[PDB]
Protein backbone atom coordinates (compact mmCIF):
# COMPACT_ATOMS: atom_id res chain seq x y z
CA UNK A 1 0.00 0.00 0.00
CA UNK A 2 1.09 3.60 -0.57
CA UNK A 3 1.22 6.03 2.36
CA UNK A 4 -2.26 7.10 3.50
CA UNK A 5 -3.49 9.58 6.10
CA UNK A 6 -6.62 10.43 8.07
CA UNK A 7 -7.19 13.90 9.43
CA UNK A 8 -9.95 16.01 10.97
CA UNK A 9 -10.05 19.79 11.04
CA UNK A 10 -12.10 22.20 13.11
CA UNK A 11 -12.59 25.89 12.41
CA UNK A 12 -14.18 28.39 14.78
CA UNK A 13 -14.85 32.05 13.96
CA UNK A 14 -15.64 34.49 16.71
CA UNK A 15 -17.73 37.15 14.93
CA UNK A 16 -18.74 35.66 11.56
CA UNK A 17 -20.50 37.69 8.89
CA UNK A 18 -24.25 37.04 8.57
CA UNK A 19 -25.04 33.52 7.33
CA UNK A 20 -21.47 32.18 7.65
CA UNK A 21 -21.07 29.36 10.21
CA UNK A 22 -19.26 29.98 13.43
CA UNK A 23 -18.02 26.35 13.46
CA UNK A 24 -17.05 23.86 10.72
CA UNK A 25 -15.44 20.45 11.02
CA UNK A 26 -14.30 18.35 8.03
CA UNK A 27 -12.56 14.96 7.83
CA UNK A 28 -10.18 13.83 5.03
CA UNK A 29 -8.62 10.60 3.91
CA UNK A 30 -5.61 11.67 1.81
CA UNK A 31 -7.00 14.54 -0.33
CA UNK A 32 -10.59 13.25 -0.15
CA UNK A 33 -13.19 14.88 2.13
CA UNK A 34 -15.09 12.13 3.97
CA UNK A 35 -17.22 13.94 6.59
CA UNK A 36 -18.62 17.40 7.26
CA UNK A 37 -20.41 19.17 10.13
CA UNK A 38 -21.22 22.81 10.73
CA UNK A 39 -23.11 24.97 13.20
CA UNK A 40 -25.83 25.68 10.61
CA UNK A 41 -26.75 22.10 9.68
CA UNK A 42 -25.85 20.75 13.16
CA UNK A 43 -25.54 17.35 11.46
CA UNK A 44 -22.55 15.21 10.63
CA UNK A 45 -22.89 14.16 7.01
CA UNK A 46 -20.84 12.11 4.54
CA UNK A 47 -18.77 13.77 1.86
CA UNK A 48 -17.75 10.57 0.04
CA UNK A 49 -20.22 7.99 -1.27
CA UNK A 50 -18.15 5.11 0.07
CA UNK A 51 -18.56 6.62 3.56
CA UNK A 52 -22.34 6.89 3.22
CA UNK A 53 -22.56 3.27 2.03
CA UNK A 54 -20.49 1.67 4.82
CA UNK A 55 -21.37 3.58 8.01
CA UNK A 56 -24.83 2.90 9.43
CA UNK A 57 -27.14 5.66 10.71
CA UNK A 58 -26.10 5.11 14.35
CA UNK A 59 -22.60 6.29 13.39
CA UNK A 60 -23.82 9.62 11.98
CA UNK A 61 -26.30 10.04 14.85
CA UNK A 62 -23.69 9.47 17.55
CA UNK A 63 -21.03 11.73 16.05
CA UNK A 64 -23.71 14.40 15.40
CA UNK A 65 -24.22 14.54 19.19
CA UNK A 66 -20.47 14.58 19.83
CA UNK A 67 -19.89 17.39 17.29
CA UNK A 68 -22.62 19.50 18.89
CA UNK A 69 -20.62 19.25 22.14
CA UNK A 70 -17.28 19.81 20.37
CA UNK A 71 -18.79 22.90 18.74
CA UNK A 72 -19.67 24.40 22.13
CA UNK A 73 -16.26 23.55 23.56
CA UNK A 74 -14.58 25.24 20.59
CA UNK A 75 -16.58 28.40 21.17
CA UNK A 76 -15.63 28.45 24.87
CA UNK A 77 -11.92 27.96 24.04
CA UNK A 78 -11.89 30.71 21.41
CA UNK A 79 -13.66 33.07 23.77
CA UNK A 80 -10.91 32.41 26.35
CA UNK A 81 -8.09 33.03 23.83
CA UNK A 82 -9.53 36.26 22.46
CA UNK A 83 -10.04 37.53 26.00
CA UNK A 84 -6.45 36.66 26.93
CA UNK A 85 -5.02 38.22 23.78
CA UNK A 86 -7.25 41.26 24.50
CA UNK A 87 -8.41 41.20 20.86
CA UNK A 88 -11.53 42.78 19.41
CA UNK A 89 -13.28 41.81 16.18
CA UNK A 90 -13.48 38.46 14.43
CA UNK A 91 -10.71 35.93 15.03
CA UNK A 92 -10.29 32.28 14.07
CA UNK A 93 -9.34 29.13 15.92
CA UNK A 94 -8.40 25.90 14.25
CA UNK A 95 -7.52 22.36 15.17
CA UNK A 96 -6.03 19.54 13.13
CA UNK A 97 -5.72 15.96 14.36
CA UNK A 98 -4.70 12.89 12.43
CA UNK A 99 -2.37 10.03 11.62
CA UNK A 100 -0.46 8.50 8.72
CA UNK A 101 0.16 4.89 7.85
CA UNK A 102 3.39 4.88 5.86
CA UNK A 103 4.20 2.49 3.02
CA UNK A 104 6.82 0.71 5.17
CA UNK A 105 4.27 -0.01 7.96
CA UNK A 106 5.36 2.74 10.37
CA UNK A 107 2.92 5.34 11.68
CA UNK A 108 2.82 9.01 12.65
CA UNK A 109 0.27 10.89 14.75
CA UNK A 110 -0.25 14.62 15.17
CA UNK A 111 -2.46 17.16 16.95
CA UNK A 112 -2.11 20.91 16.82
CA UNK A 113 -4.01 24.20 17.11
CA UNK A 114 -3.80 27.61 15.48
CA UNK A 115 -5.06 31.11 16.27
CA UNK A 116 -5.63 33.46 13.32
CA UNK A 117 -4.09 30.86 11.03
CA UNK A 118 -0.76 30.62 12.93
CA UNK A 119 0.54 27.71 15.04
CA UNK A 120 -0.62 28.11 18.64
CA UNK A 121 -0.15 24.77 20.48
CA UNK A 122 1.46 21.59 19.14
CA UNK A 123 1.17 18.21 20.84
CA UNK A 124 4.22 16.00 21.36
CA UNK A 125 2.86 12.51 22.01
CA UNK A 126 6.28 11.06 22.89
CA UNK A 127 7.23 13.50 25.59
CA UNK A 128 3.48 13.97 26.40
CA UNK A 129 3.65 17.73 26.44
CA UNK A 130 2.31 20.77 24.63
CA UNK A 131 4.59 23.22 22.81
CA UNK A 132 3.38 26.82 23.26
CA UNK A 133 4.31 29.61 20.82
CA UNK A 134 3.59 32.59 23.14
CA UNK A 135 2.39 33.39 26.65
CA UNK A 136 -1.30 32.95 25.89
CA UNK A 137 -0.55 29.45 24.63
CA UNK A 138 1.69 28.97 27.68
CA UNK A 139 -1.23 29.67 30.03
CA UNK A 140 -3.33 27.08 28.14
CA UNK A 141 -0.45 24.59 28.07
CA UNK A 142 -0.27 24.69 31.88
CA UNK A 143 -3.96 23.87 32.29
CA UNK A 144 -3.95 21.11 29.67
CA UNK A 145 -0.82 19.49 31.03
CA UNK A 146 -2.29 19.41 34.55
CA UNK A 147 -4.81 16.87 33.16
CA UNK A 148 -2.26 14.12 32.64
CA UNK A 149 -4.89 11.48 31.83
CA UNK A 150 -6.10 13.55 28.91
CA UNK A 151 -2.58 13.49 27.47
CA UNK A 152 -2.37 9.69 27.83
CA UNK A 153 -5.78 9.39 26.20
CA UNK A 154 -4.64 11.45 23.22
CA UNK A 155 -1.47 9.40 22.77
CA UNK A 156 -3.53 6.20 22.68
CA UNK A 157 -6.00 7.80 20.27
CA UNK A 158 -3.27 8.99 17.87
CA UNK A 159 -1.30 5.74 17.97
CA UNK A 160 -4.03 3.07 18.12
CA UNK A 161 -7.56 4.35 17.43
CA UNK A 162 -6.75 6.75 14.59
CA UNK A 163 -4.75 4.13 12.69
CA UNK A 164 -7.64 1.68 13.17
CA UNK A 165 -10.12 4.19 11.72
CA UNK A 166 -7.77 4.88 8.80
CA UNK A 167 -7.47 1.19 7.97
CA UNK A 168 -11.23 0.86 8.17
CA UNK A 169 -11.86 3.81 5.82
CA UNK A 170 -9.10 2.69 3.45
CA UNK A 171 -11.01 -0.56 2.90
CA UNK A 172 -14.37 1.24 2.48
CA UNK A 173 -12.85 3.50 -0.16
CA UNK A 174 -10.35 1.12 -1.73
CA UNK A 175 -11.78 1.39 -5.28
CA UNK A 176 -11.01 5.12 -5.15
CA UNK A 177 -8.02 5.41 -2.83
CA UNK A 178 -5.90 2.44 -3.89
CA UNK A 179 -6.22 2.89 -7.65
CA UNK A 180 -3.60 4.21 -10.10
CA UNK A 181 -4.23 6.36 -13.17
CA UNK A 182 -0.85 7.03 -14.88
CA UNK A 183 -0.02 10.52 -16.17
CA UNK A 184 -0.23 11.66 -19.78
CA UNK A 185 2.90 13.79 -20.27
CA UNK A 186 3.90 16.20 -23.03
CA UNK A 187 6.50 18.94 -23.69
CA UNK A 188 5.97 22.23 -25.51
CA UNK A 189 7.80 25.52 -26.13
CA UNK A 190 6.56 28.88 -24.81
CA UNK A 191 11.49 31.05 -24.34
CA UNK A 192 11.07 28.06 -22.01
CA UNK A 193 10.24 24.37 -22.14
CA UNK A 194 7.03 23.34 -20.35
CA UNK A 195 6.60 19.75 -19.25
CA UNK A 196 2.90 19.08 -18.58
CA UNK A 197 1.22 16.04 -17.00
CA UNK A 198 -2.49 15.43 -16.59
CA UNK A 199 -5.02 12.72 -15.93
CA UNK A 200 -3.19 11.08 -13.04
CA UNK A 201 -4.18 9.66 -9.63
CA UNK A 202 -2.93 9.70 -6.81
CA UNK A 203 -1.97 13.39 -6.84
CA UNK A 204 1.62 12.74 -5.58
CA UNK A 205 3.93 13.19 -8.62
CA UNK A 206 7.51 14.40 -9.09
CA UNK A 207 8.42 16.32 -12.26
CA UNK A 208 11.84 17.79 -12.98
CA UNK A 209 13.98 19.03 -15.84
CA UNK A 210 17.51 17.77 -16.32
CA UNK A 211 20.26 19.33 -18.43
CA UNK A 212 22.77 16.85 -19.94
CA UNK A 213 21.96 14.43 -17.12
CA UNK A 214 22.35 16.94 -14.25
CA UNK A 215 19.44 18.38 -12.31
CA UNK A 216 19.33 22.16 -11.95
CA UNK A 217 16.88 22.56 -9.05
CA UNK A 218 17.44 26.33 -8.75
CA UNK A 219 16.55 27.15 -12.38
CA UNK A 220 13.36 25.03 -12.62
CA UNK A 221 9.89 26.50 -12.14
CA UNK A 222 7.59 23.98 -10.46
CA UNK A 223 3.85 24.20 -10.97
CA UNK A 224 1.39 23.17 -8.28
CA UNK A 225 -0.42 19.85 -8.42
CA UNK A 226 -3.99 20.93 -9.26
CA UNK A 227 -7.36 19.14 -9.21
CA UNK A 228 -8.82 18.71 -12.69
CA UNK A 229 -12.37 18.27 -11.35
CA UNK A 230 -12.95 14.63 -12.39
CA UNK A 231 -10.95 12.94 -9.63
CA UNK A 232 -7.59 13.25 -11.42
CA UNK A 233 -4.83 15.89 -11.22
CA UNK A 234 -2.50 17.88 -13.47
CA UNK A 235 0.88 19.52 -12.94
CA UNK A 236 3.75 21.10 -14.85
CA UNK A 237 7.36 22.25 -14.59
CA UNK A 238 9.31 24.66 -16.80
CA UNK A 239 12.93 25.53 -17.56
CA UNK A 240 14.37 28.45 -19.52
CA UNK A 241 16.23 27.74 -22.74
CA UNK A 242 19.86 28.87 -23.17
CA UNK A 243 20.40 30.20 -26.73
CA UNK A 244 24.21 30.27 -26.36
CA UNK A 245 24.93 26.53 -26.03
CA UNK A 246 23.22 23.31 -27.11
CA UNK A 247 22.24 21.09 -24.22
CA UNK A 248 20.14 17.97 -24.04
CA UNK A 249 17.09 18.87 -21.95
CA UNK A 250 14.83 16.12 -20.64
CA UNK A 251 11.72 16.02 -18.51
CA UNK A 252 11.60 13.40 -15.75
CA UNK A 253 8.30 12.30 -14.18
CA UNK A 254 7.91 9.86 -11.29
CA UNK A 255 4.44 8.61 -10.40
CA UNK A 256 3.35 5.61 -8.32
CA UNK A 257 6.55 3.59 -8.85
CA UNK A 258 7.01 4.31 -12.60
CA UNK A 259 9.64 6.67 -14.04
CA UNK A 260 9.23 8.39 -17.40
CA UNK A 261 11.77 10.44 -19.39
CA UNK A 262 10.91 12.74 -22.31
CA UNK A 263 14.02 13.91 -24.21
CA UNK A 264 13.64 17.18 -26.11
CA UNK A 265 15.15 17.06 -29.64
Amino acid at each position, epitope marked *: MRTHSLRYFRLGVSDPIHGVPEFISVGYVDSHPITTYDSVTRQKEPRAPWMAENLAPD*HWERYT*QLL*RGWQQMFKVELKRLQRHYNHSGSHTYQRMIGCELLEDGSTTGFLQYAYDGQDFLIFNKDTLSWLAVDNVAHTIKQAWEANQHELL*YQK*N*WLEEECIAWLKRFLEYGKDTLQRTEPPLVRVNRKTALFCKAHGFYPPEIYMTWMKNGEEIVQEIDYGDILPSGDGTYQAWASIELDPQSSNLYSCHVEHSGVHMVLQVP
Partner: antibody
Amino acid sequence: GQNIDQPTEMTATEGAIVQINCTYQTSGFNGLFWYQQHAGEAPTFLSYNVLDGLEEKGRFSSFLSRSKGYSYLLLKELQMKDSASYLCAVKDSNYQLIWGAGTKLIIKP
Amino acid sequence: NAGVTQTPKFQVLKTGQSMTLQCAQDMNHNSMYWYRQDPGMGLRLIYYSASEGTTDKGEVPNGYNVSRLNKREFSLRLESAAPSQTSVYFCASSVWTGEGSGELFFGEGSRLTVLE
Protein backbone atom coordinates in the same frame (compact mmCIF):
# COMPACT_ATOMS: atom_id res chain seq x y z
CA GLY B 1 -21.02 -7.90 20.69
CA GLN B 2 -19.28 -5.72 23.29
CA ASN B 3 -18.75 -7.36 26.69
CA ILE B 4 -17.14 -6.58 30.06
CA ASP B 5 -16.70 -9.31 32.64
CA GLN B 6 -15.87 -9.19 36.32
CA PRO B 7 -16.52 -11.66 39.16
CA THR B 8 -19.85 -11.33 40.98
CA GLU B 9 -18.41 -11.38 44.49
CA MET B 10 -15.12 -11.67 46.39
CA THR B 11 -14.40 -12.19 50.08
CA ALA B 12 -11.08 -11.33 51.75
CA THR B 13 -9.79 -10.73 55.28
CA GLU B 14 -9.15 -7.35 56.91
CA GLY B 15 -5.51 -6.32 56.47
CA ALA B 16 -4.99 -8.50 53.40
CA ILE B 17 -4.76 -7.67 49.66
CA VAL B 18 -7.34 -8.36 46.97
CA GLN B 19 -7.18 -8.07 43.18
CA ILE B 20 -10.44 -7.38 41.33
CA ASN B 21 -10.25 -8.45 37.65
CA CYS B 22 -12.02 -6.92 34.67
CA THR B 23 -11.76 -8.28 31.13
CA TYR B 24 -13.29 -6.53 28.15
CA GLN B 25 -13.99 -7.14 24.46
CA THR B 26 -14.99 -3.86 22.82
CA SER B 27 -15.12 -2.16 19.45
CA GLY B 28 -12.14 0.13 19.96
CA PHE B 29 -10.71 1.39 23.22
CA ASN B 30 -10.46 4.87 24.73
CA GLY B 31 -9.80 3.95 28.34
CA LEU B 32 -10.97 1.90 31.31
CA PHE B 33 -12.53 3.25 34.50
CA TRP B 34 -12.97 1.85 37.98
CA TYR B 35 -15.78 3.17 40.24
CA GLN B 36 -16.58 2.36 43.90
CA GLN B 37 -20.20 2.02 44.98
CA HIS B 38 -21.11 1.56 48.63
CA ALA B 39 -24.42 -0.19 49.22
CA GLY B 40 -27.28 2.28 48.83
CA GLU B 41 -24.97 5.03 47.54
CA ALA B 42 -23.83 6.62 44.28
CA PRO B 43 -20.82 5.26 42.35
CA THR B 44 -17.71 7.41 42.70
CA PHE B 45 -14.68 7.58 40.43
CA LEU B 46 -11.54 5.65 41.51
CA SER B 47 -9.21 5.48 38.52
CA TYR B 48 -8.66 5.73 34.78
CA ASN B 49 -6.14 3.75 32.67
CA VAL B 50 -5.58 3.98 28.93
CA LEU B 51 -1.91 3.06 28.38
CA ASP B 52 -0.32 -0.14 29.63
CA GLY B 53 0.97 -0.47 33.17
CA LEU B 54 0.22 0.09 36.85
CA GLU B 55 -0.93 3.39 38.42
CA GLU B 56 -1.03 3.84 42.22
CA LYS B 57 -3.49 6.01 44.24
CA GLY B 58 -3.02 5.54 47.98
CA ARG B 59 -3.93 1.97 48.96
CA PHE B 60 -5.47 1.33 45.50
CA SER B 61 -3.61 0.63 42.29
CA SER B 62 -5.02 0.06 38.83
CA PHE B 63 -3.31 -2.03 36.15
CA LEU B 64 -4.08 -2.22 32.42
CA SER B 65 -2.93 -4.51 29.59
CA ARG B 66 -4.42 -3.35 26.28
CA SER B 67 -3.21 -6.37 24.31
CA LYS B 68 -4.80 -8.81 26.78
CA GLY B 69 -7.94 -6.68 27.22
CA TYR B 70 -7.58 -6.93 31.01
CA SER B 71 -7.41 -4.65 34.04
CA TYR B 72 -7.27 -5.21 37.75
CA LEU B 73 -8.03 -3.01 40.72
CA LEU B 74 -5.62 -3.86 43.57
CA LEU B 75 -6.66 -3.02 47.16
CA LYS B 76 -3.93 -3.26 49.82
CA GLU B 77 -4.28 -3.27 53.64
CA LEU B 78 -8.00 -3.95 53.41
CA GLN B 79 -10.23 -2.16 55.91
CA MET B 80 -13.91 -2.68 56.68
CA LYS B 81 -14.80 0.53 54.88
CA ASP B 82 -13.57 -1.06 51.62
CA SER B 83 -16.73 -3.24 51.66
CA ALA B 84 -18.48 -2.04 48.51
CA SER B 85 -19.15 -2.94 44.91
CA TYR B 86 -16.43 -2.13 42.38
CA LEU B 87 -17.59 -1.34 38.83
CA CYS B 88 -15.34 -1.49 35.77
CA ALA B 89 -16.30 0.43 32.64
CA VAL B 90 -14.68 0.86 29.22
CA LYS B 91 -15.09 3.65 26.64
CA ASP B 92 -15.39 2.18 23.11
CA SER B 93 -14.38 3.73 19.75
CA ASN B 94 -17.32 6.16 19.90
CA TYR B 95 -16.82 7.09 23.60
CA GLN B 96 -19.77 4.98 24.76
CA LEU B 97 -19.28 3.44 28.21
CA ILE B 98 -19.81 -0.31 28.48
CA TRP B 99 -20.36 -1.17 32.18
CA GLY B 100 -19.42 -4.35 33.98
CA ALA B 101 -22.00 -5.79 36.36
CA GLY B 102 -19.81 -4.98 39.39
CA THR B 103 -17.91 -7.04 41.93
CA LYS B 104 -19.22 -7.04 45.50
CA LEU B 105 -16.27 -7.02 47.92
CA ILE B 106 -16.94 -8.54 51.37
CA ILE B 107 -14.34 -8.04 54.11
CA LYS B 108 -13.97 -10.38 57.09
CA PRO B 109 -12.94 -8.53 60.27
CA ASN C 1 -21.10 23.30 45.84
CA ALA C 2 -23.62 20.45 45.93
CA GLY C 3 -22.45 18.36 42.95
CA VAL C 4 -25.37 16.41 41.42
CA THR C 5 -28.77 16.78 43.17
CA GLN C 6 -31.54 14.46 42.05
CA THR C 7 -35.03 13.93 43.47
CA PRO C 8 -36.99 12.07 44.66
CA LYS C 9 -35.04 9.49 46.66
CA PHE C 10 -37.96 7.02 46.72
CA GLN C 11 -41.24 6.67 44.83
CA VAL C 12 -44.03 4.12 44.54
CA LEU C 13 -46.17 4.20 41.40
CA LYS C 14 -49.19 2.37 40.09
CA THR C 15 -48.95 0.96 36.55
CA GLY C 16 -49.90 3.76 34.14
CA GLN C 17 -48.99 6.68 36.40
CA SER C 18 -46.72 9.48 35.19
CA MET C 19 -43.56 10.53 37.00
CA THR C 20 -40.76 13.05 36.50
CA LEU C 21 -37.33 12.68 38.10
CA GLN C 22 -35.36 15.91 38.51
CA CYS C 23 -31.61 16.30 38.24
CA ALA C 24 -29.47 19.42 38.57
CA GLN C 25 -25.72 19.89 38.75
CA ASP C 26 -23.86 22.98 39.94
CA MET C 27 -20.46 22.04 38.57
CA ASN C 28 -20.75 23.88 35.24
CA HIS C 29 -20.65 20.52 33.44
CA ASN C 30 -21.84 20.25 29.83
CA SER C 31 -22.84 16.56 29.59
CA MET C 32 -25.60 14.84 31.57
CA TYR C 33 -26.89 11.28 31.70
CA TRP C 34 -29.75 9.17 33.04
CA TYR C 35 -28.90 5.54 33.93
CA ARG C 36 -30.83 2.69 35.46
CA GLN C 37 -29.20 0.10 37.69
CA ASP C 38 -30.73 -3.37 38.04
CA PRO C 39 -29.45 -6.48 39.86
CA GLY C 40 -27.03 -8.70 37.97
CA MET C 41 -26.26 -6.29 35.16
CA GLY C 42 -24.20 -3.23 34.35
CA LEU C 43 -25.56 0.29 34.37
CA ARG C 44 -27.68 1.00 31.30
CA LEU C 45 -27.94 4.45 29.73
CA ILE C 46 -31.50 5.64 29.14
CA TYR C 47 -30.93 9.06 27.51
CA TYR C 48 -28.03 11.53 27.52
CA SER C 49 -27.36 15.16 26.70
CA ALA C 50 -23.85 15.79 25.36
CA SER C 51 -24.23 19.57 25.62
CA GLU C 52 -26.88 22.14 26.46
CA GLY C 53 -29.45 22.20 23.70
CA THR C 54 -29.07 18.57 22.52
CA THR C 55 -30.21 15.15 23.77
CA ASP C 56 -30.31 11.64 22.33
CA LYS C 57 -31.35 8.12 23.23
CA GLY C 58 -29.07 5.73 25.10
CA GLU C 59 -29.44 1.94 25.13
CA VAL C 60 -32.88 1.62 26.81
CA PRO C 61 -34.93 4.71 25.84
CA ASN C 62 -38.35 3.07 25.41
CA GLY C 63 -40.91 4.19 28.02
CA TYR C 64 -38.87 7.31 28.87
CA ASN C 65 -38.32 10.85 27.65
CA VAL C 66 -35.95 13.61 28.78
CA SER C 67 -35.67 17.37 28.81
CA ARG C 68 -32.35 19.23 28.97
CA LEU C 69 -34.03 22.32 30.35
CA ASN C 70 -30.87 24.39 30.70
CA LYS C 71 -27.17 23.84 31.31
CA ARG C 72 -27.83 22.72 34.90
CA GLU C 73 -30.97 20.56 34.68
CA PHE C 74 -31.81 17.26 32.95
CA SER C 75 -35.20 15.75 33.84
CA LEU C 76 -36.37 12.20 33.16
CA ARG C 77 -40.04 11.57 32.38
CA LEU C 78 -41.91 8.27 32.73
CA GLU C 79 -45.14 9.02 30.94
CA SER C 80 -46.95 5.73 31.72
CA ALA C 81 -45.08 3.70 34.32
CA ALA C 82 -44.69 -0.05 33.89
CA PRO C 83 -43.57 -2.77 36.35
CA SER C 84 -40.39 -3.33 34.30
CA GLN C 85 -39.36 0.26 35.12
CA THR C 86 -38.97 -0.73 38.78
CA SER C 87 -35.31 0.14 39.24
CA VAL C 88 -32.75 2.51 40.74
CA TYR C 89 -32.21 5.60 38.56
CA PHE C 90 -28.99 7.61 38.62
CA CYS C 91 -28.37 10.98 37.07
CA ALA C 92 -24.74 11.71 36.25
CA SER C 93 -22.71 14.48 34.70
CA SER C 94 -19.26 15.00 33.20
CA VAL C 95 -17.39 18.11 32.12
CA TRP C 96 -17.59 17.20 28.40
CA THR C 97 -18.12 14.07 26.35
CA GLY C 98 -16.22 12.63 23.42
CA GLU C 99 -12.98 12.69 25.38
CA GLY C 100 -11.56 9.57 26.93
CA SER C 101 -10.34 10.52 30.36
CA GLY C 102 -13.30 12.52 31.78
CA GLU C 103 -15.12 10.77 34.66
CA LEU C 104 -18.75 10.77 35.72
CA PHE C 105 -20.17 12.42 38.85
CA PHE C 106 -23.30 10.65 40.05
CA GLY C 107 -26.39 11.82 41.93
CA GLU C 108 -27.67 9.96 44.98
CA GLY C 109 -30.05 7.71 43.06
CA SER C 110 -33.87 7.47 42.92
CA ARG C 111 -35.55 4.18 43.83
CA LEU C 112 -38.80 3.58 41.91
CA THR C 113 -41.19 0.68 42.47
CA VAL C 114 -44.06 0.36 39.98
CA LEU C 115 -46.97 -1.86 41.10
CA GLU C 116 -50.08 -3.11 39.34
